[PDB]
Design a protein around this ligand. Structure first.
Ligand SMILES: [Zn+2]
Lengths: 91, 59, 95, 191, 84
RNA sequence: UUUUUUUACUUAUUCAAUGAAGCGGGGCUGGACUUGCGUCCAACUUCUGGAGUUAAGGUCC
RNA sequence: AGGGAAGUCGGCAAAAUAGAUCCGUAACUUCGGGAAAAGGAUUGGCUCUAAGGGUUGGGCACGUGCGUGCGGUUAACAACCAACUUAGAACUGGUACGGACAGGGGGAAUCUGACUGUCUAAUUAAAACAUAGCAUUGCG
RNA sequence: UCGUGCCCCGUGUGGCGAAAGGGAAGCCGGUUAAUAUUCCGGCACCUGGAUGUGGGUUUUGCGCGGCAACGCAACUGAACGCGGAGACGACGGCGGGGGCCCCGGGCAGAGUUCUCUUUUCUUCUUAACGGUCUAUCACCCUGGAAACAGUUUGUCUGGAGAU
RNA sequence: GAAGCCAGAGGAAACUCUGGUGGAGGCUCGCAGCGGUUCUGACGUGCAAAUCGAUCGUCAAAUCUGAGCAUGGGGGCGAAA
């Protein structure tokens, strides 16, 4: 039973701030309020504690991450090229 | 300050780290300590074997 | 290959899924193989390796997570570690 | 705010080998967009342990061992001198001079790129987040990775109250009155 | 009234160890032992020596604080310093 | 002997850090190149959210 | 009373509306709103009816109130206890039934500032100020 | 004891600053013209000190029991360390407890009473401090869950072991 | 009456529809509080060197407020009058 057709989580703002600004804030709110699968214990219990801080409710591990997502694409690419550079350095 | 007025067995649990750490965490500490010391002995043995092999190769 | 071998073992042989039952199998000494998932906590991983070293049981380190190991065992729940007690028709023990 | 975000002081262990610390907490710092990491090291000279406060790179977690020194591995969260890293490595909290405990690339989502090495005179060319190029001594330390909390400024503040909450813990001047809205006695733009 | 603190009255005030007495009189150990022999200052034994000093052993020597205070006024101290 | 230039130095002056803790130069050991033995470069801890502190010990008295 | 803005610079002031249940609700729109839009039907008293709950409690064979091994899901039954809502119906007084009190008048448009917010204490509360958003400049 | 010395340690620096923050400990009854958690009576508590008695422990020197979570009146513990408490936002609904409000019966008292009203109203209380038996979360043991299950008003939990 | 959640009906699925649940918002009617729009208002040597009445704005927050403390005239402070 869909109650709104497009505003979604941005319906709490009513008719204020502009359609484009509500649409822009919606993506960050959805990602920052979603639950994520923990990379240590595998359960779906990682939620944002503060900006950049993501905590797992089950295994109590706290991880430094992105502002509104648990991981940042720049950080993932950084990990990949870091692993390449580490292989080149060691070998 | 009310803890200064009651006896020692009421303020603790009769176990290592009792009244400061819980039973699960104490069990984890014991298992981790044993396994890490065993791994240290294993690494020392492997290092001695590698040193002996290097000495035999040099000699 | 390990996934197909696990499916064949699930179909034909006998397994136990989970940490406590895996420990019980290692204590009984009838465990033939132990599979440990990649994201298993390192303390539990070291404990399982020590138990298998005592019981002379082989250990396979499954490259997937506990979710992937449960899926490979054909279940709808996660599994951090599992024990094969009877290989059945598969050749998973010969490796 | 409890403690400043600095490296350990440059000592014998970091100059000649490495020292291991354990990340105990990842905490929010008011007025700062980036989270901080509390890391406990051993004191090489006494029994008591030392607690340090670093700027947390993305991917750091509680219970993680990080390594600081010349011989530390090229892994996220490790603190190495720039002479020990290859070209193209991105780092954070880079020291301008060795021992200043970190000055460059400190805010969320930012990093410093190691562009080149000149081993003859012991210099390292780096690229800053503003795009500027700089030469620093090669013994300056940096933490491998990118500062956590990136993408913070992508979300609109949307409300005067959220701007007020942002700046009240920061001491920055808010609200801001325009100079042209003022009388000539107050501002040169006044009137 | 105001709550007292532990270890500020009783035997902790009644007794001093030999180290505390020697530092209190600002003497060397031979001069202190000589003066105790000459003035009749005798070793004493508290009921609980931990209440006096937490580092005390069975070989720790104790004296009365009032006896040490009395030794503070002996004219031989200035004689010792004059001879030095 | 003096006037300009640059081109080194450190001792005045200036900046920073530390609990002023390991700087500089050798010796020992190992690795390389070299020359047929001088350089430079390395000693020491990386599976784990444990623990590390009151010197054990050797040898002359 | 009758008329109903003829008054007045100007509907100033007053009057009218008002609670709750039900029917129904346009343009415009940033699709969230507009909206209690608009426009309608009703409401007292009395005597009834219906609906919405809680607790307790199962047969054998042995050992001897518990243990077993059974057997059964019509307890879909009994006993006891309990409170406030909702709907339906008859009867009945009436000039009034949200009977005092309490309590939106509504609508068509134009200009204007995005909105919430703030200031000239003691003549100006506003198209003024702020605001989020946007743009530029300086600094390693 | 070469008697007039030697060893260990490192962290700095003092004070003021809150009758609403933090914080050791007191309740009830009575009493005055006027004070009362302050007086009086009864019944307690905290902090500090000294030193006894009983009880405990010990000839296996520093207790015993429970698989465990842990229990029991005791049941050594310096330096140097680790940890906890002090010690913490705003808002929303849900559940437990005290007090208040409300209903019924009973004893006693009071009012109403032309008529009616087995009536309307009032008293019916229990402190600190203790003992004892219990109280959501959570944790432990057995065991191993798909025909997935448990479960909140609110969809969370479970092979990292649920029911 | 926003996300999230449950059920039913569809849809190859993604999704769609229906009924509930839930309780978000510098949302809204409105009591106290805070403020101060209007009235040929009261008062005008006043109760008052700024008060009184009715009406009005706001009312879960950029809300109201105490104490302690800081900024001092070539200054301060100023959502700027
Ligand atoms: Zn986790």
């Amino acid at each position: 039973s869909k109650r709104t057709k497009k505003v979604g989580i941005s319906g709490k703002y009513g008719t204020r701030y502009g359609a484009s600004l509500r649409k822009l804030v919606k993506k960050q709110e959805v990602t920052q309020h979603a639950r994520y699968t923990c990379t240590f214990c595998g359960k779906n219990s990682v939620r944002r504690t503060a900006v950049g801080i993501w905590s797992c409710k089950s295994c109590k591990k706290t991880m430094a991450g992105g502002a509104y997502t648990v991981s940042t694409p720049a950080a993932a690419a950084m990990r990949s090229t870091l692993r390449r550079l580490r292989e080149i350095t060691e070998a | 300050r009310e803890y200064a007025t009651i006896s020692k067995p009421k303020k603790t649990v009769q176990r290592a780290y009792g009244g400061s750490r819980c039973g699960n965490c104490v069990r984890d500490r014991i298992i981790r300590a044993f396994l890490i010391e065993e791994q240290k002995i294993v690494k020392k043995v492997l290092k001695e074997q590698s040193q002996a092999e290097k000495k035999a190769s040099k000699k | 290959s390990i996934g197909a071998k696990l499916a064949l073992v699930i179909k034909s042989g006998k397994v136990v899924l989970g940490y406590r039952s895996t420990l019980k199998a290692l204590r009984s000494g009838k465990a033939k193989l132990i599979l440990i998932a990649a994201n298993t906590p390192p303390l539990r991983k070291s404990e399982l390796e020590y138990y298998s070293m005592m019981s002379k049981t082989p250990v396979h380190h499954y490259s997937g997570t506990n979710i992937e190991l449960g899926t490979a065992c054909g279940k709808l729940f996660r599994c951090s570690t599992m024990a094969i007690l009877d290989a059945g028709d598969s050749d998973i023990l010969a490796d | 705010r409890k403690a400043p975000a600095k490296f350990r002081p440059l000592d014998y262990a970091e100059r000649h080998g490495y020292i291991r610390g354990i990340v105990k907490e990842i905490i929010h710092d008011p007025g700062r967009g980036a989270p901080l990491a509390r890391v406990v090291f051993r004191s090489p000279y006494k029994y008591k342990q030392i607690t340090e406060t670093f700027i947390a790179n993305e991917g750091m977690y509680t219970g993680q061992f990080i390594y600081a020194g010349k011989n530390a591995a090229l892994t996220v969260g490790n603190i190495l001198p720039l002479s020990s890293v290859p070209e193209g490595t991105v780092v954070s909290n880079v020291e301008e001079k060795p021992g200043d405990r970190g000055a460059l690339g400190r805010t969320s989502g930012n990093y410093v790129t190691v562009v080149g090495h000149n081993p003859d005179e012991g210099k390292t060319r780096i690229k800053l987040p503003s795009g500027a190029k700089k030469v620093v001594p090669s013994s300056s330390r940096g933490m491998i990775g990118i500062v956590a909390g990136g993408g913070r400024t992508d979300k609109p503040l949307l409300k005067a109250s959220r701007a007020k909450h942002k700046f009240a813990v920061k001491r920055n001047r808010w609200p801001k009155t325009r100079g042209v809205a003022m009388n000539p006695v107050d501002h040169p733009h006044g009137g | 009234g105001k709550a007292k603190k532990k270890g500020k009255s009783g035997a902790a005030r009644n007794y001093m160890t030999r180290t505390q007495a020697v530092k209190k009189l600002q003497l060397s150990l031979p001069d202190f032992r000589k003066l105790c022999i000459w003035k009749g200052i005798y070793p004493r034994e508290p009921r609980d020596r931990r209440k006096v000093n937490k580092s005390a052993t069975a070989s720790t020597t104790f004296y009365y604080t009032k006896d040490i205070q009395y030794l503070l006024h002996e004219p031989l101290l200035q004689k010792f310093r004059e001879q030095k």
